[model samples]
Target chain A: NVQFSNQDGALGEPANYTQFQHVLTESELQISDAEGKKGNKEYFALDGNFTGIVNQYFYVDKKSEALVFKMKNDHLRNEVRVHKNFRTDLPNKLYTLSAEVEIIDPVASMKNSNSKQNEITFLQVANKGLDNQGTHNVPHPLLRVVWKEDANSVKGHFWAMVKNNAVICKGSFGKKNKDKEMCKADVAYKKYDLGKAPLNKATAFDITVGNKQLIIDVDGKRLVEHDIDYWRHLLSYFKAGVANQFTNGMSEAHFNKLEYKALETK
Target chain B: NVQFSNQDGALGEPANYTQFQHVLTESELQISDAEGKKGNKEYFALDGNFTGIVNQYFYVDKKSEALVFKMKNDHLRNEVRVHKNFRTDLPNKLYTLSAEVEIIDPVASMKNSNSKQNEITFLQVANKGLDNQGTHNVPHPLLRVVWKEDANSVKGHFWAMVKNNAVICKGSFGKKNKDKEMCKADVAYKKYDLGKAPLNKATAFDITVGNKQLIIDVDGKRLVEHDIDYWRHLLSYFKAGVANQFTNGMSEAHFNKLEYKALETK
Candidate 1:
């Protein structure tokens, strides 16, 4: 049993506050304030005094013998990116992120405008353009494991910067309202139970790009066997943690087990 | 067969911004501009502005048909408070909370000052002064399940309003200068497994007061049976969850089960 419970070990932080790949610190928030990156009372830093951090959180748990990564912020979620280290070689090569995780957070495939909780992003498989594009003003996450919060369900969708303009979440686009249609749609979660795939268990999740298709597997049960149409031209890497702001004010998920591996073959 | 995955239901939010219970919504944070409560980012909805909230985070997972609370946030850990929900009348009556939780988050009775990740609170039992003492001015949290991230271990501590200045942390105070005894001391987490504890496998935890011995149980094993010699005079309640800033990003805890009961006699 591998318990990655290393909160004291320096697996999260980096040398400076230049990227989100490193674990955030109260001082880093202060660095933002000092460098004037963030203003006062920005929800991320609470007081903007650096009393805490604004990125996603990750840790190793001894009990569950896993790497427990979470996203718990009202405004934004936490994130971890592996730059310099990428996952593909164009054509048939691939980068697959494998982890056995269980998401207990309230999930929804689509958001409920009436409730803010529904707007939160639960989980995802992403390529955080950390290498070629940098942090800001870049295309984000190649795939997403989102919760509808209102529909009380979950879905897997593809996110690629298509035709010059980013086709963010085309599947979740509001169908009822023409203006909202496909505006933020991620394309309805293609396969699996859609609403209740893993239901309740520590399911193994593997998000792979190319290798045939943009495949997502949960507990051996594959989901959203989507087509990897655009990644043939995308340059990115693997990132798994609480991705971004899905809910407001510290939303968290617990994982008892976790592992990350990069493979060349299928 | 139970998902306990109830993401659509609204669990954390206040009807109005009057109480600190509301989950901070983006608009609500914007609403602060209209209301005179939270000026910019006063931190802690203590003044009720949806800035920062005090306490850990928790939820009930119905999949296992058990109480499952969680902690997800960016800056610090999360929490849940049972406001105006007082438990006992002291002297004879009492309340006991028990949970089969694993400290997936590294448990360190000591913190990693070098890393902000160490500055986090894993769990706790507190009296979120719901009675009229209000959120801002009231002395917070009566009991705590803290992890000294430095020591890389878990321990139980006491937090109560003291004789003169409120003794929030009665343990660390004396380490520096004996005079600062109650200064930062929550009283060295007394009782059971001071250093060695098997953190994995959904272990049980019990929190009880009368607590001539503040009792804390771990999977049939008891710990930190401290002496709550003064709580007999204080009127507080129980509040639990992933309680407090353990890491900057999403901090969380999983519960296979949990139970909180108000006692009748000793």
Candidate 2:
């Protein structure tokens, strides 16, 4: 059993910081950074000065004692969010990540485009490897727990997305066009119209990934399930917090608890 | 992680009996039983009449509240013991068993003989499979935590015995006599003279058995350690309690705590 937060509801400083890494919204730049710079306003600050930037993105709620994560629309940046990272390096094992949270604001795209707008990601399982091109080791989320507002009404709905390179969608790739191949495939993408989002109310979100299966649950309700036996060769990890895509408006959530555990069998 | 006892100094009834099996002193019998009957005075009683027999062998001390285990001189039976069994059916995992105990009385044989007399075991790692002959699945302790009193003076000493069928001693069998080969092989057996044990004081005993290694610690002091990479093909379990071989005089100990845990890695 591993806990990422302390009794005071603050992110714990685990020994060696190996249990999980705090990816501040404005931290060191990676290849994914659109600007390709070491620091950005949407993430961590430079010189390890986290006082203002960290407070802008993540902080413990003084009165409610909850973990607050905020992401704003920054069209120029690739993403604007703060998250915690947990490695899933083994090829065989089950990893479960869960959290108790309340939605403070439904995500809305401030962008002028009409497609792929207003997306907020609360949790994800991402491959820590090279892209299909192999030009650079560009890690990307293979599984995403996303919420979106289709129109200006902001009627938030749930979605479970599985990116390309997944064995589950491998068979159908041949019939699709080159532009619509594996990495861009949407055959495994699913939408769950679980009514409208219950803003300001606590909800439980759980996601389990393994070499043999993938399971998702929301407030004790099973949402998505799949046998992932073909995923035995993939290496992934978990990222939890608020990951907002699109440069307009803002996305925010309050997290009460988070847990991560694994079981390995030979 | 699992705890076998409670804060009130009593054995806890887990949700399922799978955590461990308590082998009482007066209970059922198997092929190894000399009489070859289902019931024996040295084990759990038939009709489930446990009051008298259970109190005779195991009970809580009134003053100290420690769990007391006793074995008396009963030469008519094959062996007398009261133990707890934990399964280790996996080959690619690590199992650790530890306990806090106090030796109330060291073991000694009252029989009119010399050689292999008086022996008491407090902890062991045994195979759950069949014996070397395969006629019957008579599970026996492969690695024993034994204490012996050579003379009447009771200068109790410790020994770690690993029975035959071990890969560690497989090479030496060709040159040795058949009757003393494998199961009866003493090539891998070892002895440690930790001097006289603190008979009435608290002592900590820890044993870790893995596919690649074995470690023993006494009162936070390392007593035995060995590389066991060849043990990857074996299936085993843990047993803790009072097991007496030379059914004479008696063997007794007071147990204060017991813990068992495992970690699996492919």
lDDT of 1 by residue, A199-248 (tens): 56665666676543566666676755655433322345554444333433
Across B94-142, the per-residue lDDT of candidate 1 in tens digits comes to: 6676656555544432233234544334345454321233221124455
What interface RMSD does candidate 2 have? 21.9
TM-score of chain A of each: 0.55, 0.64
Give the C-alpha interface root-mean-square deviation per candidate. Answer: 27.0, 21.9
Q: What tier of docking accuracy does candidate 1 attain?
A: incorrect
Q: After aligning candidate 1 to the native by TM-score, how far in Å is the CA of A123 from where it should be?
A: 4.2
Question: Which window of 10 residues has the lowest lDDT sum in candidate 1 chain A?
Answer: A26-35
- What's model 2's TM-score? 0.37
Q: Give the per-residue lDDT digits (tens) of candidate 2, residues A4-45.
A: 233453443211132123333222311123333332433334
Q: Which residues of candidate 2, in runs, are more than 4 Å off?
A: A1-54, A75-92, A107-115, A130-139, A151-154, A167-177, A180-185, A188-195, B1-266
